[PDB]
Amino acid sequence: SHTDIKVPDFSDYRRPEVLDSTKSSKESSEARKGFSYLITATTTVGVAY
Amino acid sequence: LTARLYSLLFRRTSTFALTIVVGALFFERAFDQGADAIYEHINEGKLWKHIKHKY
Amino acid sequence: HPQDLEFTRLPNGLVIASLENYAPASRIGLFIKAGSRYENFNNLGTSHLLRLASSLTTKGASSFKITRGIEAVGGKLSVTSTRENMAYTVECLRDDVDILMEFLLNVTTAPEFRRWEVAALQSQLRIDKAVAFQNPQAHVIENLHAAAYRNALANSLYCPDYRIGKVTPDELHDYVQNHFTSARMALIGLGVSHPVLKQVAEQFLNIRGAKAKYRGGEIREQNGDSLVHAALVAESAAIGSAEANAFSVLQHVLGAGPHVKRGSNATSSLYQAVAKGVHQPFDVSAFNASYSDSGLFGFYTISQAASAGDVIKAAYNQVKTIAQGNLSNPDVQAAKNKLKAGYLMSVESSEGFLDEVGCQALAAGSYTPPSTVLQQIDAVADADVINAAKKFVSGRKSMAASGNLGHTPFIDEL
Amino acid sequence: INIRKTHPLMKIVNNAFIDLPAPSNISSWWNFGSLLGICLILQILTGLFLAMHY
Amino acid sequence: ATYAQALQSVPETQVSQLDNGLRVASEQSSQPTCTVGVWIDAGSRYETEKNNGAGYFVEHLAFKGTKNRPGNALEKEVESMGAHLNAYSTREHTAYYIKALSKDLPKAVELLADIVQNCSLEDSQIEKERDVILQELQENDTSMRDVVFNYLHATAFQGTPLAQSVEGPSENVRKLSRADLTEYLSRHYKAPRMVLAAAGGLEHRQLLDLAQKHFSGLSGTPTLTPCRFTGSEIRHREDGLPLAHVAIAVEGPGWANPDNVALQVANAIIGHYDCTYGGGMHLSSPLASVAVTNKLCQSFQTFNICYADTGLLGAHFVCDHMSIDDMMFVLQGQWMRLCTSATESEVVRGKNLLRNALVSHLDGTTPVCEDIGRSLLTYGRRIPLAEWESRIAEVDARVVREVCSKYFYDQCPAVAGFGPIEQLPDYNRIRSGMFWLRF
Amino acid sequence: SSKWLEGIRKWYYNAAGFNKLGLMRDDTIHENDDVKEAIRRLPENLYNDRVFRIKRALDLSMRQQILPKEQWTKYEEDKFYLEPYLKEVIRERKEREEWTK
Numbered sequence A: 001s002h003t004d005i006k007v008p009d010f011s012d013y014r015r016p017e018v019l020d021s022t023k024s025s026k027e028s029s030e031a032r033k034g035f036s037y038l039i040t041a042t043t044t045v046g047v048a049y
Numbered sequence B: 001l002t003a004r005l006y007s008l009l010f011r012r013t014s015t016f017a018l019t020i021v022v023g024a025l026f027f028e029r030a031f032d033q034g035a036d037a038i039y040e041h042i043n044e045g046k047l048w049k050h051i052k053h054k055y
Numbered sequence C: 001h002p003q004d005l006e007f008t009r010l011p012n013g014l015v016i017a018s019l020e021n022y023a024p025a026s027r028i029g030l031f032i033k034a035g036s037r038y039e040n041f042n043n044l045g046t047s048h049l050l051r052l053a054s055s056l057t058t059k060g061a062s063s064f065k066i067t068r069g070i071e072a073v074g075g076k077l078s079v080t081s082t083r084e085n086m087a088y089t090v091e092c093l094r095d096d097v098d099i100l101m102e103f104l105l106n107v108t109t110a111p112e113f114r115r116w117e118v119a120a121l122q123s124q125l126r127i128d129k130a131v132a133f134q135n136p137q138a139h140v141i142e143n144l145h146a147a148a149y150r151n152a153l154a155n156s157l158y159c160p161d162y163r164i165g166k167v168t169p170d171e172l173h174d175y176v177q178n179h180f181t182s183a184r185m186a187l188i189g190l191g192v193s194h195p196v197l198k199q200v201a202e203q204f205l206n207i208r209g210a211k212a213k214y215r216g217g218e219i220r221e222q223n224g225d226s227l228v229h230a231a232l233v234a235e236s237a238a239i240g241s242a243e244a245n246a247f248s249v250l251q252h253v254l255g256a257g258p259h260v261k262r263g264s265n266a267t268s269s270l271y272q273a274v275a276k277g278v279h280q281p282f283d284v285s286a287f288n289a290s291y292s293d294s295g296l297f298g299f300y301t302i303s304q305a306a307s308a309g310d311v312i313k314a315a316y317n318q319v320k321t322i323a324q325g326n327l328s329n330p331d332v333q334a335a336k337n338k339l340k341a342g343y344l345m346s347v348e349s350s351e352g353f354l355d356e357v358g359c360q361a362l363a364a365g366s367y368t369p370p371s372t373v374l375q376q377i378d379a380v381a382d383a384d385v386i387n388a389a390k391k392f393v394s395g396r397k398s399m400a401a402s403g404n405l406g407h408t409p410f411i412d413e414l
Numbered sequence D: 001i002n003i004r005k006t007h008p009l010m011k012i013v014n015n016a017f018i019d020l021p022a023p024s025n026i027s028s029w030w031n032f033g034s035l036l037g038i039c040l041i042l043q044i045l046t047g048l049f050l051a052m053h054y
Numbered sequence E: 001a002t003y004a005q006a007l008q009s010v011p012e013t014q015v016s017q018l019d020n021g022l023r024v025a026s027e028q029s030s031q032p033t034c035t036v037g038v039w040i041d042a043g044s045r046y047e048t049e050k051n052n053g054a055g056y057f058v059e060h061l062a063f064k065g066t067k068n069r070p071g072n073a074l075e076k077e078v079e080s081m082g083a084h085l086n087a088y089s090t091r092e093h094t095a096y097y098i099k100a101l102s103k104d105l106p107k108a109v110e111l112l113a114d115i116v117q118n119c120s121l122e123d124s125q126i127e128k129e130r131d132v133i134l135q136e137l138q139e140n141d142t143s144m145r146d147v148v149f150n151y152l153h154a155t156a157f158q159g160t161p162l163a164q165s166v167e168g169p170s171e172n173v174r175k176l177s178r179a180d181l182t183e184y185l186s187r188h189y190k191a192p193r194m195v196l197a198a199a200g201g202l203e204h205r206q207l208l209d210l211a212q213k214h215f216s217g218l219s220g221t222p223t224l225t226p227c228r229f230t231g232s233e234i235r236h237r238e239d240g241l242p243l244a245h246v247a248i249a250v251e252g253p254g255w256a257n258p259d260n261v262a263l264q265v266a267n268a269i270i271g272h273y274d275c276t277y278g279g280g281m282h283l284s285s286p287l288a289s290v291a292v293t294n295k296l297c298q299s300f301q302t303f304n305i306c307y308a309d310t311g312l313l314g315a316h317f318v319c320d321h322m323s324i325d326d327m328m329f330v331l332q333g334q335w336m337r338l339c340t341s342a343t344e345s346e347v348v349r350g351k352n353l354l355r356n357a358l359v360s361h362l363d364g365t366t367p368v369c370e371d372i373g374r375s376l377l378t379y380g381r382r383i384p385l386a387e388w389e390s391r392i393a394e395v396d397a398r399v400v401r402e403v404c405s406k407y408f409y410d411q412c413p414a415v416a417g418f419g420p421i422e423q424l425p426d427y428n429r430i431r432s433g434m435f436w437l438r439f
Numbered sequence F: 001s002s003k004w005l006e007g008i009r010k011w012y013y014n015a016a017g018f019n020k021l022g023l024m025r026d027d028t029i030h031e032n033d034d035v036k037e038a039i040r041r042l043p044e045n046l047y048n049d050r051v052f053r054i055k056r057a058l059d060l061s062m063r064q065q066i067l068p069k070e071q072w073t074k075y076e077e078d079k080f081y082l083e084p085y086l087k088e089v090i091r092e093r094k095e096r097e098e099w100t101k
């Protein structure tokens, strides 16, 4: 049951910089986390002010 | 460049909260001056600071 | 490391078998012949309870200190058992063997068995028995030993379904009192020196069965599993005999677990006979246990539901047509090489080599090096081969089968 | 283990706000319950300040 | 006696490089046996979409014909010399080894060489082994554990060749050919990529020239792209099973870091528990202590698996559906406790467990020579035990909390759930529990 | 010294009160998880005698009925049976604290 599995792909949904199975992602995580946490922090600044 | 800012001021949540409070008072300063400049620009003339300066 | 072992049988009764080498894996074994053949009818399951009782408080060394210190120095402690033997095996480095030895001595010879811990260990017995007998084949072996003896070799590794929650620790106290002599204990050391062990075992303990009768018959366990598991065993011989070595050579002739992964075992005559007869999934094997008074030998089949009796008949007539004086001397030499390979290559790993050295030193109470065992393998000829095969074919029978039993012959219809 | 599953108040908060199984279907038409609750406490607050000056 | 006393007299494992791209390794000491094996860097990672599962197929078909002997006489030779044989193939490597005795070393080398390079194939044998591998896939429906790990790889490496299954899918089992398989064997298992190791009662000179006689003459003369971790969630809701298997992993470093040493210390701290252990409420491992105290699971192994310079730093716990969430939460709490408040005696105990477990891992000859082959593939060398002990002592709590800061703290894991897994929290609960605002 | 200390102790045991409700030492101990563990580690028959003493004492304090002269529990015929149990609870809890720290 499990060996006959191909995981369907989300090519339309990913970021256009991590669309490479060659490319490693030790470092590119911090840009994405900085973007999202930037949004959360700026929202928190607006809320607390 | 975003990853460098994540490396600096987004990891330890205590310093995270403290630095967004610092940015919040930064935003207080900039936002009050922005609102004052814009509202005086759309009401150049008919505001009491003008007439009081002429008094 | 050319230096070798040192045997020292201290005459109060115990056996020190030291081996000083420059090895990391400092292993200490304490072997006592106190397995399941020393119970009686009243306290069945007690040995299983003691085997799970390796983590209980002693007089002065509480179980918290025991577990925390042992897993804090990193050394791992296991306890295994055969129907004769219990074995306390502690592995560590040469760092803190003295305090680990002192914990081992306290665990053996300061029994308390406090009562709430006994109840938690009852629940642990139910857990352990479920995890054991989720393999059906061990249950087949347990019904097999239940099918062959009226006596001490009929008991269980484990506990029955009703004594769980009903066994009292006073039985443990009196059983340890009347079954742990100094005259049965084997301290087997790999890594530490002989004089340190001499000092410990000389100054630190200084405190102080029933044979086998053949029974015969069969035990059928209707279970509905699409896997007929069927063992057919007759009594063979005692241990330490050239007769028993001849049974060993005979089962290397008949067939064991495969030497080659995903092989065919062409020299295994039993698989050849059922392959010539049956065209199905199956498996056929031999089986030999041997103990200090008697032993058991036969074959062991795993087959389909509607394909049981054909497997049984083919393997039994194969054993008969080898026992009719019709054999191959290249198969005799091949079995001698396979038995040499088996004994010489079950003794590489320090756990198995420790167990083998200690059991070979304790079993008849006398060490034997492997080279003269290879010589005795070289000494047993075809006369006792055909004699032991004729005794097995024209002897009594014992059968243990479990699973679906639609077409299983009983005794006569082999 | 955790305060949230062994404390008598956070059992209630855990069974009301956190481990509540929500259906994964509801649109913005279902938002008006929490908005009614927040409007209710906001009316309580503004009315209470009115009550301090009336 | 000290670690200088134990490590001054220590086996050495001399190596050489035979002049065809062949490597050789010898663990020479006084043991009366030999383990002689061929380690070749070939697995499902190097394979393609059409060649998926061809390697598993090879290690099935490596015994049903050679140009010098038929199949029954070949393994009959293995029997008649009185030996033992084994082989396997992971996603990256493949070992064909022989557990034999020292007095049959040259015949072992000879028959092993014919096993490696000159297999012969049959239409009957490809049909029989196609049926056997189909039935054993339907049998690997039963082994839940590797189903979970294959789910884990397939969801953590989505799109790479690393997420190809170990054995190949069933159509890609039942459709392959002889020509593709010869092209497979000719591309992968031939000239540069092979380590002949041997351990035991052996020498270097006779062994050396026997390998020169039997394995040379080949002279063959473009794969291994870098990979990508993703972090995602796959679940197999199957509400009839009595147990649930839940595993979760983050992107570990791989082979080529001291981060490997630090995470082996951390997964020596947490590591293993099974529910048949002796001493339950007085456990040393605090996660296991809580997991017994409130029955929060049945078993777990928390560990690391390294592919070629990439890592699955993982945990795998088996439980009942009644207490999935509790075991999940206390797992994340123990990771964050390593991340922030790494104390002293836990680091000392982790180093001691790493010492004793690595020593007992280096037992016998077959696991040690397996470690030899796997070390000479990836590392290019076998690490001495004194170097292991030196790298153990070269880490204190500071390196541990830095490595937990890099790898555990606030990353994007991959989750594989199997069974009664409805009461598993959703993926955002795992993420918002992954980072502390001190909760 | 000691010949007068016993007089003080017997005066305090008269004036304590639970000698009149038919109780003993181990009947009034305030509980944490540790003392309830000591209760859990008791033999069965002693635990039965303890629960019967407790239930009589609660009944006789429910109708506020002190026992007669015949069953006031005398001083120094009572068992300090929880001393080994509670003492080992002390030692185990201190072992946990002083070993893990």
Ligand code: HEM
Pocket (backbone or CB within 6 Å): D040, D043, D044, D045, D046, D047, D048, D050, D051, D054
């Ligand atoms: C319990 C908290 C509340 C207090 C203490 C409170 C108090 C008051 C007071 C003092 C007024 C007179 C001030 C005024 O009329 O401008 C008022 C007006 C009013 N309140 Fe509340 N109120 C409360 C909650 C509510 C709620 C929940 C509602 C319904 C949504 C409500 C609806 C109104 C309305 C419709 C008026 C009339 C506004 C007007 O006509 O000027 N109040 N309330």
